[PDB]
Structure 1
Amino acid sequence: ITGTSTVGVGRGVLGDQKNINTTYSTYYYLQDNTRGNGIFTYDAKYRTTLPGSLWADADNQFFASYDAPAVDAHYYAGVTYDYYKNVHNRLSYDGNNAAIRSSVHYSQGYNNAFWNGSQMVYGDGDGQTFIPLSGGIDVVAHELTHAVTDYTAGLIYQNESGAINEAISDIFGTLVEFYANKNPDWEIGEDVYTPGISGDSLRSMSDPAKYGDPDHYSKRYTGTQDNGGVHINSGIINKAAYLISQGGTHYGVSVVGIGRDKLGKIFYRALTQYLTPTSNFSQLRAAAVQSATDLYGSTSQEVASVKQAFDAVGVK
């Protein structure tokens, strides 16, 4: 909408106070004009029609329980925008400052979040499996990264390309979480998963097997569930990424870590310059090696470590 840029204040899903960029025109809307062509947050009102209504508030204060998922969807979209712009010189998901749209309060007791081809969508959770999913910065960044992937490599959402797609979203979800630097880790969704159980998460990049996901190509899933295991086989690539960044010895193969920033540069370049819609794991290895070669040189430690990491997870 047309209006003037304002700054509201509210509380997120975890009870933390934050400022948010709003727009005033009769109401205060969750419309942040400070980033690209805007970040817009909508109320789906427990229904499934999208996007719903642009979030309107009378007083620019967002402290109601009902407000919390909107505050976080809006704020964490801003953090994710900032990560891509400041770290990778990418302007929004399409590289041309496309408006970023999110809807919260999607459906009833909805234990998921997704990119629907055009916007981000967040359930509230059922209160047991999940609390409102926009409370997780890694979740918000995971979702926006699906848009980045779709506009770039275009990895088809099934089988190995789909597992790469998923891992890309977990990798950048995590790198955004580290960028914001509040309780960062290499787990996925820990801030919103199972409020009654401490110390768990949906997936682990550092040890995928802790939640039953494969950490080696010989353990890949080849059945039909989950689009051919896109959230399962992502563990193989997540583990490779974790090893590239942090190092370790895995099934007897030692990897020299090169740190998060270089992991991000290598994978961002692979995603945007080398991967294609049908890339498989072997082709991802080749894309990562080439990306590291471009950035650091063929004789570099960075190239050597990429090779070691893919060796460790059984991908040649």
Structure 2
Amino acid sequence: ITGTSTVGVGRGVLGDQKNINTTYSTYYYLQDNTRGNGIFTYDAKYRTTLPGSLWADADNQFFASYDAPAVDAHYYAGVTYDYYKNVHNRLSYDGNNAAIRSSVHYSQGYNNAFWNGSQMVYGDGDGQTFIPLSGGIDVVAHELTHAVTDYTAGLIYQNESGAINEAISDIFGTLVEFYANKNPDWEIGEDVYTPGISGDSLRSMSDPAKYGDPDHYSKRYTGTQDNGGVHINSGIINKAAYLISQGGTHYGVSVVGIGRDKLGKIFYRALTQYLTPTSNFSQLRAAAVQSATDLYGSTSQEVASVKQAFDAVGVK
């Protein structure tokens, strides 16, 4: 909508207070005009028709419990935009400042979030398995990164390509979490998963096997569930990325960490320059080695660490 840019205040899913960019025109709308062509947040009103209604508020104050998932979806989309712009010189997910749209309150008791090719969609969870999914910055950044992947490498959501697609989203989701410095860790979804249980999460990058995902290529899932294991076998790639950044010894193979910043740069380059829709794990290794080579030289520590990490998880 056309109107006056302003700033509202609200409370997120976890009860934290934050400022959000809104737009005033009779009502205050969740429309942020300060980033690209805008960030727009919609109310799906417990239905499955999308996008729903552009979120309208009478007084520019968002403290109702019904408001919380909208506040965080809007706010964390902003933070994710800033990350990609400031760190990777990328303007929105298409590189041309495309408007970012999110709907919250999707369906009833819906325990998921997703990018549907056009926008983000967040369920409220059932209150037991999940609380509203936009309360997790790593969740929001994970989803938005699917959009980036869609417009760049175009990794098919299936088998090894899909696993890479999933891992890329976990990696950048985590990097965004570190960027905003909000209780950062190498776990996925811990802020909104199982409010009854402390210390757990949906997936772990540092130790995928903690929740039954493979941390080695020999333990890959070869069946047909989950589109050929795209959320399962991502563990293999997630562990490799964890090792590149932090280092460690894994199945007897030692890896010197080179840190988060370089991890981001290497994988961003691989994603945007070298990966293709049908890339498999072995091609990912080659892309990553080549990207580090481009950035730091063929005899750098960086190239060496990327090699050791993939060696460690059994990807040749």
User: TM-score, normalising length from structure 2?
Assistant: 1.00
Quote the offset at 1:27 in angstroms. 0.3
The C-alpha deviation readout for 1:153-187, integer Å capped at 9, x for no partner, is 00000000000000000000000000000100000
**How far 1:103 moved relative to its partner?**
0.2
**Aligned residue for 1:128?**
128
Equivalent residue, structure 1, for 2:179? 179
Q: Secondary structure at the match of 2:262?
A: helix
CA–CA distance in structure 2, aligned partners of residues 188 and 169 of structure 1 = 10
How far apart in 1 are the matches of 2:153 and 2:233?
A: 18
Q: What is the SS of the residue equivalent to 2:156?
A: coil
Could you tell me how far 1:150 is from its partner in structure 2?
A: 0.2
Q: CA deviation at 1:128?
A: 0.2
In the alignment, structure 1 segments of 5+ residues that lack a partner are none
- TM superposition shift of 1:298: 0.3
Distance 2:280 2:23 in 1: 44
1:89-147 deviation per Cα after TM superposition (whole angstroms, max 9, x unaligned): 00000000000000000000000000000000000000000000000000000000000
SS of the aligned residue for 1:106 comes to coil
Cα deviation 1:177-214 (Å, max 9, x = unaligned) = 00000100000000000000000000000000000000
For the residue of structure 2 that corresponds to 1:141, the secondary structure is helix
- Structure 2: how far apart are the matches of 1:264 and 1:95? 17
Q: Cα offset for 1:3?
A: 0.4
Measured in 2, the distance between the counterparts of 1:229 and 1:52 equals 32
Deviations 1:211-251 (A, max 9, x none): 00000000000100000000000000000000000000000
Residue aligned with 2:201, SS: coil
Moved over 4 A (4+): none
* Distance in 2 (alpha carbons) for counterparts of 1:37 and 1:222: 42
What is the CA–CA distance in structure 2 between the aligned matches of 1:121 and 1:214, rounded to whole Å?
28
Give the match's secondary structure for 2:292: helix
CA–CA distance in structure 1, aligned partners of residues 63 and 158 of structure 2: 40
Structure 1 position 84, deviation (Å): 0.1
Partner residue in 1 for 2:309? 309
> Per-residue displacement from partner, 1:30-60 (whole Å, max 9, x unpaired)?
0000000000000000000000000000000
Distance 1:270 1:46 in 2: 39
**Partner SS, residue 20 of structure 2:** strand
Instruction: Find the aligned partners of 2:249 and 2:192 in 1 and give their Cα distance.
Output: 31
Q: Distance in 2 between matches of 1:293 and 1:272?
A: 15
CA distance in 1, matches of 2:163, 2:146: 12
* Structure 1 counterpart SS, 2:184: coil
Query: Partners of 2:228 and 2:54 in 1: how far apart?
Result: 36
Cα shift at 1:15: 0.2
Gaps of 5+ in 2: none
Q: CA RMSD in A?
A: 0.2
CA distance in 2, matches of 1:172, 1:227: 22
User: CA separation in 1, counterparts of 2:265 and 2:116?
Assistant: 27
Structure 1 length normalisation: TM-score?
A: 1.00
User: Offset at 1:80?
Assistant: 0.1
Q: In the aligned structure 2, how far is the partner of 1:46 from the partner of 1:239?
A: 37
Q: Secondary structure at the match of 1:36?
A: coil
Per the alignment, residue 141 of structure 1 pairs with: 141
- Alignment partners' CA distance in 1, 2:280 and 2:182: 34
> In structure 1, what is the Cα distance between the partners aligned to 2:72 and 2:88?
23
User: Partners in 2 of 1:302 and 1:90 — Cα distance?
Assistant: 23
Counterpart Cα distance in 1 of 2:239 and 2:233: 10
Q: Deviations over 1:42-82 (max 9, x none)?
A: 00000000000000000000000000000000000000000
